[PDB]
Amino acid sequence: DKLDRADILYNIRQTSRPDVIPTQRDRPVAVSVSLKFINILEVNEITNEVDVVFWQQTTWSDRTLAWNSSHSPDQVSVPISSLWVPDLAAYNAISKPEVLTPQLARVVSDGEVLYMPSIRQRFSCDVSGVDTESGATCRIKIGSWTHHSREISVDPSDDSEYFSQYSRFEILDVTQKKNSVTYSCCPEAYEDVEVSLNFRKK
Amino acid sequence: DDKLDRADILYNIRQTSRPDVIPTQRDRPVAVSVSLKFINILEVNEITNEVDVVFWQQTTWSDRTLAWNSSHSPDQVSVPISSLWVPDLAAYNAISKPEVLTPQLARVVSDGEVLYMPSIRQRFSCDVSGVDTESGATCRIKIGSWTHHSREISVDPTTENSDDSEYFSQYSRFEILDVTQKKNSVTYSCCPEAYEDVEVSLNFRKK
Amino acid sequence: DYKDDDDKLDRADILYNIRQTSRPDVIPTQRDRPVAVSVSLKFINILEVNEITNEVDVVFWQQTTWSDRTLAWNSSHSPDQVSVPISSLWVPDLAAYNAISKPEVLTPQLARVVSDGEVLYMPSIRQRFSCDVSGVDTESGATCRIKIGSWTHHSREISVDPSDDSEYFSQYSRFEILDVTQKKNSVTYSCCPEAYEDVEVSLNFRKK
Amino acid sequence: KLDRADILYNIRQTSRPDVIPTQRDRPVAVSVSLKFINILEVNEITNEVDVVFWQQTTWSDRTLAWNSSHSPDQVSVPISSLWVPDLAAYNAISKPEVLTPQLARVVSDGEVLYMPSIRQRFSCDVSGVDTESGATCRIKIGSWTHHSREISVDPDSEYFSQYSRFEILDVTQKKNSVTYSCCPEAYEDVEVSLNFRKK
Amino acid sequence: DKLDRADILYNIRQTSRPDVIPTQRDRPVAVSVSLKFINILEVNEITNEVDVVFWQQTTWSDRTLAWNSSHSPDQVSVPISSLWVPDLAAYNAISKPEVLTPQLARVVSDGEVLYMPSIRQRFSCDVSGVDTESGATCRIKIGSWTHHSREISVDPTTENSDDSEYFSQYSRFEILDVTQKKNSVTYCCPEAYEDVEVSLNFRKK
Numbered sequence A: 001d002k003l004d005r006a007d008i009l010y011n012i013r014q015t016s017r018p019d020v021i022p023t024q025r026d027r028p029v030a031v032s033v034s035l036k037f038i039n040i041l042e043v044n045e046i047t048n049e050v051d052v053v054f055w056q057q058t059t060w061s062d063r064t065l066a067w068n069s070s071h072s073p074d075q076v077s078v079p080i081s082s083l084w085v086p087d088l089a090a091y092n093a094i095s096k097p098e099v100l101t102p103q104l105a106r107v108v109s110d111g112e113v114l115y116m117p118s119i120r121q122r123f124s125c126d127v128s129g130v131d132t133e134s135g136a137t138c139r140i141k142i143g144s145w146t147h148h149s150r151e152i153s154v155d156p157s158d159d160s161e162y163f164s165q166y167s168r169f170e171i172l173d174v175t176q177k178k179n180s181v182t183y184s185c186c187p188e189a190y191e192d193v194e195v196s197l198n199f200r201k202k
Numbered sequence B: 001d002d003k004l005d006r007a008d009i010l011y012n013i014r015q016t017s018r019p020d021v022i023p024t025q026r027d028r029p030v031a032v033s034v035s036l037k038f039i040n041i042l043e044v045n046e047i048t049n050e051v052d053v054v055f056w057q058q059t060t061w062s063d064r065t066l067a068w069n070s071s072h073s074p075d076q077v078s079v080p081i082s083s084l085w086v087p088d089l090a091a092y093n094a095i096s097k098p099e100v101l102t103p104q105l106a107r108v109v110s111d112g113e114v115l116y117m118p119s120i121r122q123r124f125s126c127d128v129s130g131v132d133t134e135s136g137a138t139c140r141i142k143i144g145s146w147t148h149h150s151r152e153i154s155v156d157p158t159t160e161n162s163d164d165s166e167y168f169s170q171y172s173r174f175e176i177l178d179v180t181q182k183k184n185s186v187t188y189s190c191c192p193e194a195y196e197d198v199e200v201s202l203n204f205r206k207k
Numbered sequence C: 001d002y003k004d005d006d007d008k009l010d011r012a013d014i015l016y017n018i019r020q021t022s023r024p025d026v027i028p029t030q031r032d033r034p035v036a037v038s039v040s041l042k043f044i045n046i047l048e049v050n051e052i053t054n055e056v057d058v059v060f061w062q063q064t065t066w067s068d069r070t071l072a073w074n075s076s077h078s079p080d081q082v083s084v085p086i087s088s089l090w091v092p093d094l095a096a097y098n099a100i101s102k103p104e105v106l107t108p109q110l111a112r113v114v115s116d117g118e119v120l121y122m123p124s125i126r127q128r129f130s131c132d133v134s135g136v137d138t139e140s141g142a143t144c145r146i147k148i149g150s151w152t153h154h155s156r157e158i159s160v161d162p163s164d165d166s167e168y169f170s171q172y173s174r175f176e177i178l179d180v181t182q183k184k185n186s187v188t189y190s191c192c193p194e195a196y197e198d199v200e201v202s203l204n205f206r207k208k
Numbered sequence D: 001k002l003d004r005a006d007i008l009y010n011i012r013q014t015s016r017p018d019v020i021p022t023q024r025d026r027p028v029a030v031s032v033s034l035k036f037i038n039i040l041e042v043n044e045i046t047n048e049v050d051v052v053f054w055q056q057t058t059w060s061d062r063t064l065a066w067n068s069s070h071s072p073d074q075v076s077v078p079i080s081s082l083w084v085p086d087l088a089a090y091n092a093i094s095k096p097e098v099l100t101p102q103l104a105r106v107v108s109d110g111e112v113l114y115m116p117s118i119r120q121r122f123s124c125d126v127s128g129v130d131t132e133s134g135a136t137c138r139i140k141i142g143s144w145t146h147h148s149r150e151i152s153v154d155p156d157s158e159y160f161s162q163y164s165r166f167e168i169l170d171v172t173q174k175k176n177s178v179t180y181s182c183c184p185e186a187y188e189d190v191e192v193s194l195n196f197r198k199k
Numbered sequence E: 001d002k003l004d005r006a007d008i009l010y011n012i013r014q015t016s017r018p019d020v021i022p023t024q025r026d027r028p029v030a031v032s033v034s035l036k037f038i039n040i041l042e043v044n045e046i047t048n049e050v051d052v053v054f055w056q057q058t059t060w061s062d063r064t065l066a067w068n069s070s071h072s073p074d075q076v077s078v079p080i081s082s083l084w085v086p087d088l089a090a091y092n093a094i095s096k097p098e099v100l101t102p103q104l105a106r107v108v109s110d111g112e113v114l115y116m117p118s119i120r121q122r123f124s125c126d127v128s129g130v131d132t133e134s135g136a137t138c139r140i141k142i143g144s145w146t147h148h149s150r151e152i153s154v155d156p157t158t159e160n161s162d163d164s165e166y167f168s169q170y171s172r173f174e175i176l177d178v179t180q181k182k183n184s185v186t187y188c189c190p191e192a193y194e195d196v197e198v199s200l201n202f203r204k205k
């Protein structure tokens, strides 16, 4: 139903505060992050650099966006410029994230938001072992760039489902674990997810 | 060529157009047609399984709320796509952004049919095995909505495919053997719902 | 008239008038005739030539002219012309059909508007084309053809109308120009029942 | 949350992003510190380095301060809502490519912290990268258009990537003042000396 | 005085017409341009192409911007979007000018504007001689892209003794001479565009 959709969008834009974190109660916003690797385009064992493509499945809640969907759309697509989005960054990225897909999020009637862009990006990590049976394991650390743990908490197979069958590489395993970083710059602590990409030449 | 009519039609389109809302009529998905007309193959990396291609992405759909009586006014106008809803199509196996080489205008017809046909340069990760053999390489490109499931958006091939190579450059060092563009459906771990795509199979070889 | 061209308040008023009456998204068809667009490519440099891939990298000044009589003003005592950001004007939606890269505009995106309604837009463009590079090393040279036309307006809406470019081409190029010729064409495409006009620019050139 | 929204609205009511936040007829004291993360490419024939670093930048605008006794201490703010120093690297030969979200932190006392991850290429002396004492690459950073009476600039094993082909021996960052041909006044700058070598 | 600054910026934005040439009386705008070379990055003797970095020192007046500064700041930095800037282009440039510095101009209380971006750009020019002792002489013409001489005059700055003063010692090249002179180009039609012709005499070290 189109008018319903347009009304939901209007509602979302009236209540959405894109530059403000949506803390519910005084708890931090829980953001779920899962990288789905699609391809591995270039590897350099010499420089320890990696060029990759992945779907960054990112979800969280803003209960204030919720509506009653008994007689209306459960979900709509929304431009992320209308929404708050976690300021995630990869601490070992050496190129800026090149978003390859339309910048739309899904908002579910319960206030859940799913943003899943396809990103091409290059990293500085441990490429040693590529041409080995065991293969290399390359570790990507992703976290909020400016919100510490009291403001944002970050939580998280072989990706047979998504990985290209045409890549000069294959994935042996991927694991994602929660992890904390604290830096000389800032007293408050930051949460990251450590994504371990275990892969080898095909 | 009545200009003031063109200006009024544009006014009405922008009054009516909701660029961020899918134009569903009744309770039926928006029926989007996509077809890739191939113009060039620029680079083919046998090492890495990548191809850089140029194609006109013929995209059509209807938004009957935009329609107008054209018995004594212009049948069609050109419109900037930022005034229009445009389907959120993406190539699921692309490895670069789609580079639009042409003016980002769509044609809106008086019955509310919309035609957007950019020329795109884009790189894909696909099977490049066989490119220098007689029977050639076959690269597969999947195009579908990035965020709308099939209850929301249907995507189908266009009726005419016989023109898929008609505009391919005779100066390309590659030549096209066959193209097929066929309906397919994709489901995933993330989302319980299904997405429609047109799978394009591009069979080509080095001259 | 000349004697009033540098009247600043007059220039600002002309700009105001243009922005009031300009419809940047609506083609300026006068009476019931197509907008007559004149296109002339003035080649400046041939940068990269590849005889294998049949690709050429070039720089040219794209002299584009057309008229919109609604922009017109009486200049017998005010500026004859002004510079205008093209984002304030309607501009033909020209595209080069055999381009294989985005046209990189290298100059300020300003057009000239003349008091009689004429609009003159001439960007410096760098762009890569897919065209015929065979024979670039011979005496008679290669002939690279570039096809330029409106991307979405057919012939009833926009019509297109078109030397050795001695005057413009870089003396320091590795290549030289024999001839540049430009012919009108009209074509119907598989997508659409109507016919689109284009210009074919034949760039006859050789390695020095 | 509502308190966050209101602080942000106050910041945007009082912030003049194109006006330097001078207090008391004193220049804005900007403190800079580069935390090198990666050395990506060293071209010995052209004397060019490609590097990734965290540009820790801080200053105060006390007209942004609020009473935090019963509201948050800090928020994140888009830098387009804030004045930021117009720092530039004088020996840069590419645009700064900002790799991170363009958010600053604003602290309830009016302190602003902006720390982008930046990838940029520099013209500097890479002679010696294949020696044990290494090469020393000097990066000169300062305000591009604000002289000393307007802006003053004042000055990595934990940060530097272990996977880099390179290794840092020593980073030093020293104040410097200069007077240029265009203009009578003097501009302050920080000279960042990066001593590094190939493993 | 910060408030004074915000007021000056407000006055400038009340008065400045960013798209209209600031002709004073009935005369052309006098723009002064000078390139201070910082670097020469790549040079190709076959293709006759150079890649250079330079500060594009640009100045002109808009008296309507002027204000009394006896008890207020004599200078402010303004974003160039708030100002009219001349539409300069290098007639033999073969890439877009990559601005490397913050896009801020200085406005001085007497109405003088200084805009001086650091630009990286590639040109087509005579690279023959670059490996000989006498070196190559590459010529760059800079002028208004759309304003003829009766609207904008382009002249060198008074000072060009400093053209190579900030040149990188770590360049694989070196500059022997720089000359920056008045020129006029004319084409079909009677209008002439004034330009500054920069002759860069350089060689490989």
Ligand SMILES: *[C@@H]1O[C@H](CO)[C@@H](O)[C@H](O)[C@H]1NC(C)=O
Pocket: C074, C075, C076, C077
């Ligand atoms: C323009 O103005 C002059 C008066 O200065 C008048 O004589 C002339 O007829 C006008 N032109 C038109 C077309 O109205």
Ligand SMILES: *[C@@H]1O[C@H](CO)[C@@H](O)[C@H](O)[C@H]1NC(C)=O
Pocket: D067, D068, D069, D070
């Ligand atoms: C801060 O607010 C608290 C109560 O909200 C009050 O006790 C205190 O006096 C205030 N301090 C300042 C500096 O305004």
Ligand SMILES: CN1CCC[C@H]1c1cncc(F)c1
Pocket: A144, A145, A146, A183, A185, A186, A190, D103, D104, D105, D113, D114, D115, D116
């Ligand atoms: C600790 N955060 C995460 C990485 C860098 C650092 C940071 C960046 N911008 C503003 C901050 F307050 C802190």
Ligand SMILES: CN1CCC[C@H]1c1cncc(F)c1
Pocket: B056, B105, B106, B107, B115, B116, B117, B118, C150, C151, C152, C189, C191, C192, C196
């Ligand atoms: C006439 N153009 C040239 C090829 C395709 C066709 C076209 C492109 N976009 C919108 C159209 F209506 C038509």
Ligand SMILES: CN1CCC[C@H]1c1cncc(F)c1
Pocket: A104, A105, A106, A114, A115, A116, A117, B145, B146, B147, B188, B190, B191, B195
């Ligand atoms: C259905 N799309 C195709 C790929 C992934 C999935 C998707 C992408 N972005 C947001 C979604 F909700 C779903």
Ligand SMILES: CN1CCC[C@H]1c1cncc(F)c1
Pocket: C111, C112, C120, C121, C122, C123, E144, E145, E146, E193
């Ligand atoms: C100074 N340029 C060089 C050629 C002519 C002149 C020019 C360029 N673009 C638009 C014009 F109106 C004039």
Ligand SMILES: CN1CCC[C@H]1c1cncc(F)c1
Pocket: D143, D144, D145, D180, D182, D183, D187, E055, E104, E105, E106, E114, E115, E116, E117
């Ligand atoms: C301090 N910068 C370095 C070069 C010149 C000076 C500068 C740059 N832009 C505008 C100025 F006013 C001054």
